[PDB]
Amino acid sequence: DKTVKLWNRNGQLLQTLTGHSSSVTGVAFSPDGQTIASASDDKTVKLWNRNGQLLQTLTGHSSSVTGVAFSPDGQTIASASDDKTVKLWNRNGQLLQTLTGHSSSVTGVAFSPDGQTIASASDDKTVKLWNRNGQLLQTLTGHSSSVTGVAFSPDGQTIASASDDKTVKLWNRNGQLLQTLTGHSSSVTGVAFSPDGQTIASASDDKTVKLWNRNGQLLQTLTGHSSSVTGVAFSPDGQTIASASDDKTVKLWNRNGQLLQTLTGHSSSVTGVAFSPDGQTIASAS
């Protein structure tokens, strides 16, 4: 619906961020909690303040931007694009690096917890790992279809990837495949680690979030969305799970799988969700 919405944990809408000229595909909070970054099919990243207003527009990608992330220190923004690149930007919106190496669209991006490695997911079926000088360090091969999302474990030693092959895969930094999470019945659209590292959450077009242990065994299936689930996130305290869906909602769930809230207000599909660092604000992209 071309907006980002900001909500509290009780379901109350706080702000609507208007200005993108096409779909918003992803959202992230800065580590100080004051700035929100959004990615859009209009080929831009926008930076917004939590009071609801646009600060900056980062132009430069030549196709849709599919995801955005902040470094742990807040000083670098990473964006993924169908132009086959990841771009790294400073907080002035100046372009620092373009990471080239993927041979098709880049669908997601994440920073390692130490801020020194970037992971990218691509339709070329790979995850690539990079440093902040744009140098390619490793390619993770094994998915049999497009990779849709990527995340680092809190200790930084395990990478999780989501794929249209219906799996999540877990890897080390040397590119070794460690575990495959098999169980979704359609494409997996996103993956996240709990802050203690002991639960993995995955989102799927099968309309569920699944929760798994670190051996890749299914622990719970969260049912309730009425269309594809497009993203998932854990709150910083680990006590709340957020899911985004083509049913136009975000749902909030406790760790026991109980539905806590549905965030209703977007007028089209929700494509991503994020928690503020204090865990009290949720951002949704649509």
Numbering used by the authors: 0 to 285
From the reporting publication:
β-Propeller proteins are common natural disc-like pseudo-symmetric proteins that contain multiple repeats (‘blades’) each consisting of a 4-stranded anti-parallel β-sheet. In the larger propellers a so-called “Velcro closure” is found, in which the N- and C-terminal β-strands are part of the same β-sheet, keeping the propeller closed. This “Velcro” can occur in different positions; in the “Velcro 1-3” variant, the closing β-sheet consists of one N-terminal and three C-terminal strands, while for the “Velcro 3-1” variant, the opposite is true. Starting from a highly repetitive β-propeller sequence, we designed a consensus motif sequence that formed a perfectly symmetric 7-bladed β-propeller.
To avoid bad interactions between the close termini, the N-terminal residue was removed. In the case of V22WRAP-T, this was impossible as the loop lacks a glycine. While the space group and packing differ between the crystals, the structure is identical for each protein. In both Pizza and WRAP-T, the “Velcro 2-2” conformation is the least stabilising, which presumably explains why it is rarely observed in nature.
